[PDB]
Amino acid sequence: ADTIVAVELDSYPNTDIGDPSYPHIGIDIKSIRSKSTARWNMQTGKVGTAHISYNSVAKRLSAVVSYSGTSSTTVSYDVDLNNVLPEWVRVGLSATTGLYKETNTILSWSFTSKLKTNSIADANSLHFSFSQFSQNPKDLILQGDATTDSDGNLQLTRVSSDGSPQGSSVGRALFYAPVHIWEKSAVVASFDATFTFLIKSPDRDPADGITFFIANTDTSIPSGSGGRLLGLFPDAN
Amino acid sequence: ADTIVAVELDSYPNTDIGDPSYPHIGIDIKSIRSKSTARWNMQTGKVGTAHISYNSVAKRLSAVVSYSGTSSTTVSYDVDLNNVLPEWVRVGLSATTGLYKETNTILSWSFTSKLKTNSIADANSLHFSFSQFSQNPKDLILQGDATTDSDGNLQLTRVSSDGSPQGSSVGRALFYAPVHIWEKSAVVASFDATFTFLIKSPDRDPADGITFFIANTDTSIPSGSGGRLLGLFPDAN
Amino acid sequence: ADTIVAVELDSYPNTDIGDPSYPHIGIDIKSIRSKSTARWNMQTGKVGTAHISYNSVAKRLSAVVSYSGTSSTTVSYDVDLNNVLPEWVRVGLSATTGLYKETNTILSWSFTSKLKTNSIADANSLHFSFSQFSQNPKDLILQGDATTDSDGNLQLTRVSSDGSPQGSSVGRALFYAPVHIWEKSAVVASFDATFTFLIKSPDRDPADGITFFIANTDTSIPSGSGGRLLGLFPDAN
Amino acid sequence: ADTIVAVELDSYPNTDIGDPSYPHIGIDIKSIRSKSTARWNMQTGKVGTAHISYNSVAKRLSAVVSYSGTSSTTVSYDVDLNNVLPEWVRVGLSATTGLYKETNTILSWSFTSKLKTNSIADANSLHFSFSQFSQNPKDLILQGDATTDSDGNLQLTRVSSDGSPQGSSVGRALFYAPVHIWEKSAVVASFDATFTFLIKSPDRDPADGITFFIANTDTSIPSGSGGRLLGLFPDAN
Ligand SMILES: OC[C@H]1O[C@H](Oc2c[nH]c3ccc(Br)c(Cl)c23)[C@@H](O)[C@@H](O)[C@@H]1O
Ligand SMILES: OC[C@H]1O[C@H](Oc2c[nH]c3ccc(Br)c(Cl)c23)[C@@H](O)[C@@H](O)[C@@H]1O
Ligand SMILES: OC[C@H]1O[C@H](Oc2c[nH]c3ccc(Br)c(Cl)c23)[C@@H](O)[C@@H](O)[C@@H]1O
Numbered sequence: 051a052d053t054i055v056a057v058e059l060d061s062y063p064n065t066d067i068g069d070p071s072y073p074h075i076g077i078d079i080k081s082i083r084s085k086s087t088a089r090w091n092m093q094t095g096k097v098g099t100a101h102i103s104y105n106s107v108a109k110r111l112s113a114v115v116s117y118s119g120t121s122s123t124t125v126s127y128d129v130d131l132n133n134v135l136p137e138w139v140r141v142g143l144s145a146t147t148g149l150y151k152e153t154n155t156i157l158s159w160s161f162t163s164k165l166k167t168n169s170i171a172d173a174n175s176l177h178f179s180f181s182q183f184s185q186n187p188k189d190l191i192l193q194g195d196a197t198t199d200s201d202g203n204l205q206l207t208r209v210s211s212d213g214s215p216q217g218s219s220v221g222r223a224l225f226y227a228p229v230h231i232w233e234k235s236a237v238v239a240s241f242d243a244t245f246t247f248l249i250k251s252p253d254r255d256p257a258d259g260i261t262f263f264i265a266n267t268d269t270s271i272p273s274g275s276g277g278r279l280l281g282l283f284p285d286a287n
Numbered sequence: 288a289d290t291i292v293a294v295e296l297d298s299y300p301n302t303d304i305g306d307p308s309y310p311h312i313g314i315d316i317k318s319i320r321s322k323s324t325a326r327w328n329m330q331t332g333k334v335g336t337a338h339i340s341y342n343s344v345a346k347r348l349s350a351v352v353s354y355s356g357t358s359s360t361t362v363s364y365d366v367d368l369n370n371v372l373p374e375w376v377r378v379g380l381s382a383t384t385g386l387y388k389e390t391n392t393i394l395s396w397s398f399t400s401k402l403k404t405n406s407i408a409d410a411n412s413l414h415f416s417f418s419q420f421s422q423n424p425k426d427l428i429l430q431g432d433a434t435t436d437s438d439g440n441l442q443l444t445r446v447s448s449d450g451s452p453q454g455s456s457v458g459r460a461l462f463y464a465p466v467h468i469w470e471k472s473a474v475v476a477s478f479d480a481t482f483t484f485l486i487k488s489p490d491r492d493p494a495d496g497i498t499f500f501i502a503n504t505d506t507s508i509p510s511g512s513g514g515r516l517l518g519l520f521p522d523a524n
Numbered sequence: 525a526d527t528i529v530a531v532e533l534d535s536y537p538n539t540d541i542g543d544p545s546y547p548h549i550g551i552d553i554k555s556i557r558s559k560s561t562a563r564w565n566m567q568t569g570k571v572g573t574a575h576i577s578y579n580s581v582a583k584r585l586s587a588v589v590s591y592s593g594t595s596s597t598t599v600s601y602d603v604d605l606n607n608v609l610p611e612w613v614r615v616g617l618s619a620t621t622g623l624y625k626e627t628n629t630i631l632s633w634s635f636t637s638k639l640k641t642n643s644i645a646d647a648n649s650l651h652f653s654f655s656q657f658s659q660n661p662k663d664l665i666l667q668g669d670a671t672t673d674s675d676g677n678l679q680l681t682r683v684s685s686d687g688s689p690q691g692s693s694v695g696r697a698l699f700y701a702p703v704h705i706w707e708k709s710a711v712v713a714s715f716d717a718t719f720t721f722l723i724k725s726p727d728r729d730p731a732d733g734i735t736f737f738i739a740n741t742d743t744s745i746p747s748g749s750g751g752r753l754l755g756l757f758p759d760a761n
Numbered sequence: 762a763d764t765i766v767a768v769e770l771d772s773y774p775n776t777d778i779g780d781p782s783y784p785h786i787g788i789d790i791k792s793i794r795s796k797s798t799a800r801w802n803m804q805t806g807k808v809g810t811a812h813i814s815y816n817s818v819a820k821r822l823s824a825v826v827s828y829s830g831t832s833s834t835t836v837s838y839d840v841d842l843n844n845v846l847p848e849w850v851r852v853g854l855s856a857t858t859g860l861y862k863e864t865n866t867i868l869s870w871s872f873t874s875k876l877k878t879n880s881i882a883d884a885n886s887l888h889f890s891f892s893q894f895s896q897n898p899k900d901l902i903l904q905g906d907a908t909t910d911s912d913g914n915l916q917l918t919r920v921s922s923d924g925s926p927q928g929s930s931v932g933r934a935l936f937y938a939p940v941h942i943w944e945k946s947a948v949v950a951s952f953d954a955t956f957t958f959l960i961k962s963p964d965r966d967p968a969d970g971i972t973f974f975i976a977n978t979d980t981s982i983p984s985g986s987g988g989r990l991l992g993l994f995p996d997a998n
């Protein structure tokens with residue numbers, strides 16, 4: 051199976067697999083059953099922003115999800131990630147719908163990884179930033195239903211020609227190049243990610259959510275990973 | 288008095304004011320009596336590197352001090368810094384000698400602060416990097432004995448025309464511009480700093496150390512802050 | 525007198541001091557009489573963006589001023605800037621009104637300077653970015669009429685409590701720290717600047733314009749520099 | 762055939778295909794016959810640094826190649842690159858030996874591309890930096906003889922187990938992800954690259970050189986591109 055570390059923006063509470071009874075953000079370490087969650091007052095139809103950070107000295111994975119003027123939700127978890135993940139990874143965004151649905155629209159996405167040793171000049175860094183997505187994004191690996199649309203946005207899940215979201219959809223976008231997130235001689239390894247998103251829905255209880263995730267480089271959408279599994283895991287273990 | 292947050296590279300153990308009985312790195316929150324320390328196997332005559340990081344989501348101030356091939360020391364402390372520090376600050380390096388002495392030579396120094404809201408474009412950022420220091424550094428506020436020398440290095444404490452360190456010395460260097468490290472509407476505030484240093488000494492027990500610190504913008508060397516107080520505090524409370 | 529290098533967004537044609545007969549952007553080297561200009565179809569009431577770049581290898585100062593979907597104007601000039609400017613400078617924005625008027629509202633401003641030698645790690649860099657301006661910007665030197673307003677914007681020229689622009693106004697904002705833009709041992713020196721602006725006016729022929737400029741560190745608004753002189757020069761020579 | 766833009770550090774003068782009669786740096790636009798060259802006093806056995814820059818406003822491709830304390834060579838050429846290159850590219854380093862030989866050792870390599878529109882936040886950016894190369898660089902496409910060695914350096918051309926260079930060698934390293942270097946709606950597109958290199962040789966006239974190049978994403982070493990052709994072109998046209 052894949053090896054998965056993820057920050058989930060979980061719009062739909064699946065209490066039968068350990069979700070809290072409200073929409074939440076969570077930190078997922080090799081399981082959909084989040085190691086840490088926080089209540090998320092998500093705002094359908096508003097543009098939100100997520101910021102995710104980690105470094106190997108502090109060993110604290112943190113995320114904040116915000117809507118201008120409305121709400122800020124933070125979640126953190128203490129974990130040695132470079133003990134969980136392989137040394138080379140790909141990074142990506144995932145999203146799903148299930149019986150219930152929502153758009154999972156990514157408006158922008160940026161990421162920075164640094165592998166330091168003894169200097170101000172790092173041993174390695176990778177930074178990418180997209181504030182719009184081209185119609186043929188050659189630096190993205192699109193998986194499942196993920197497409198880019200005429201407005202330059204990344205639609206992780208299926209939307210109709212009029213933009214209405216569809217159920218039973220899964221899609222992911224990985225950055226094309228592998229990322230060297232740890233190396234035995236590194237003094238410190240860090241990563242930071244930001245994305246902005248727009249979740250719209252006609253459902254009373256929209257679903258299922260969006261994640262930023264880090265995985266083995268050959269990661270692919272698991273069989274049976276739809277809906278509540280957010281396109282990351284094959285089961286709810 | 289000034290308001291001080293600092294990471295100390297403390298070369299001399301002053302057990303009578305709460306130092307551990309070995310050279311150590313420490314996190315100092317408004318007191319020379321570190322809130323957290325780690326044993327530091329410091330290598331006289333070798334170039335070392337310090338990396339310091341913090342963000343307001345994780346609320347964990349961490350530092351790693353390293354010598355290539357030799358040693359790595361890490362220390363962390365959980366603290367809401369933007370509750371300790373004013374909204375505007377200056378950032379700097381300090382060093383001292385006392386009865387015992389050492390060079391406190393800074394070879395390079397970089398710093399980044401970010402004040403984010405809802406976007407990939409921050410509300411504010413400041414980044415500076417020096418890999419050498421000019422003879423008249425107009426973007427530094429030099430305090431006490433601090434000078435720049437013919438090799439382009441920053442000598443925080445007094446050195447002879449032949450480079451031999453002198454006792455009873457204190458010096459600091461602040462970046463000229465104030466730094467906006469928090470603002471009530473910020474989603475996240477972060478800072479990162481790196482410097483490389485060279486501590487040489489003919490003393491069996493060199494002293495006193497080097498710090499990276501953050502203070503009120505009008506910070507100045509306190510009266511009586513020499514030696515064990517590292518040019519940051521007026522007393523050992 | 526001051527030593528001035530500037531990119532002017534000149535909204536008002538003063539043909540009697542060498543302006544073209546249309547609104548224009550220009551490159552100014554120690555004179556309001558631009559060394560190079562380009563016609564600027566400026567859009568009152570729309571947010572524009574300016575990008576300015578230079579490096580000491582290419583020795584070409586270039587600027588592009590754009591309005592989304594509407595227009596793009598470019599101007600360039602071949603010049604050895606590090607032969608014109610002192611080694612230490614301050615960088616800033618200026619604006620004026622005269623008999624005719626306009627708002628000179630800066631919404632965001634960023635700047636990067638790099639002083640390189642033999643490595644990927646530079647000898648020096650400075651980067652700052654403002655996507656909003658605080659009510660008390662301690663890292664800006666405000667000169668003349670320049671203020672920051674309740675929306676977080678920088679108003680270079682005087683505006684009424686209702687936002688109506690006033691005539692006979694001059695204002696500038698400098699970054700607080702001096703910038704080391706050349707050094708004899710540098711392999712390459714570069715700078716880049718971006719700002720976004722909003723010019724509104726009830727006048728048929730708004731005036732006078734906005735500049736990004738680089739000057740001696742002790743630069744101040746010259747006597748008699750109002751209106752057509754854009755707060756940069758004491759005369760039209 | 763491939764579409765090639767390159768900066769060549771040409772150590773061996775092949776006057777029969779248009780080289781100057783001395784080692785030189787050159788700007789190559791779809792031909793090994795450089796559009797612009799400069800004399801290069803290359804220093805065998807010393808570490809050199811190359812810096813390359815371009816932006817679509819200035820439309821000037823420039824390079825500087827330097828040895829600390831010894832020499833600086835600059836070359837520039839005015840060209841609309843985004844009229845020469847496809848919209849998506851890969852970027853890389855190449856090197857060759859022929860009858861004569863040299864090591865073509867890359868010690869570090871960094872690259873930044875920016876695709877801007879109306880804001881401080883770009884429409885796209887990609888930045889990578891390597892100050893050492895891992896034994897299995899999963900973010901590099903190694904072509905021909907290129908390998909990474911035990912010191913963490915990139916050896917573009919073949920070297921013996923003792924480090925002696927071999928003749929008749931060609932090797933290239935491309936960054937894994939494609940790069941979006943132009944887009945019709947971009948206000949400005951820019952790129953910058955730096956690498957440091959070490960050329961050693963026992964030959965009186967070492968050969969053949971190192972390039973930084975930009976090409977169609979599916980670029981590969983052309984048949985017959987050895988020696989004087991630097992692994993970039995199939996012929997000397
Ligand atoms: O899209 C939201 C959810 O829809 C389905 O689960 C249900 C939500 N309400 C229900 C009511 C009945 C049944 Br049976 C199911 Cl399976 C559900 C499943 O597709 C879940 O994986 C998904 O999280
Ligand atoms: O430079 C190292 C130290 O030297 C002095 O303290 C002493 C170190 N060994 C001693 C022995 C005797 C006395 Br009395 C003192 Cl005050 C010291 C003081 O200057 C200390 O502040 C300083 O940390
Ligand atoms: O604000 C626009 C201009 O207004 C004044 O110049 C005039 C513009 N139209 C005029 C008509 C008459 C006279 Br007299 C003047 Cl001085 C002007 C002067 O203040 C100029 O410096 C300025 O560029």
Ligand SMILES: OC[C@H]1O[C@H](Oc2c[nH]c3ccc(Br)c(Cl)c23)[C@@H](O)[C@@H](O)[C@@H]1O
Binds near residue numbers: 859860861989
């Ligand atoms: O490595 C340097 C050069 O060696 C060969 O060319 C020669 C350099 N000196 C010569 C002398 C004779 C002949 Br025949 C050749 Cl082909 C050469 C060829 O391999 C060239 O492509 C290459 O640039």
Ligand SMILES: [Ca+2]
Binds near residue numbers: 064
């Ligand atoms: Ca769920």
Ligand SMILES: [Ca+2]
Binds near residue numbers: 297298299300495515
């Ligand atoms: Ca001590």
Ligand SMILES: [Ca+2]
Binds near residue numbers: 537
């Ligand atoms: Ca004018």
Ligand SMILES: [Ca+2]
Binds near residue numbers: 771772773775780989
């Ligand atoms: Ca040649």
Ligand SMILES: [Mn+2]
Binds near residue numbers: 058060070074076082
């Ligand atoms: Mn969940």
Ligand SMILES: [Mn+2]
Binds near residue numbers: 295306313319321
């Ligand atoms: Mn201590």
Ligand SMILES: [Mn+2]
Binds near residue numbers: 534543544548550556
């Ligand atoms: Mn003009």
Ligand SMILES: [Mn+2]
Binds near residue numbers: 771785
């Ligand atoms: Mn040549």
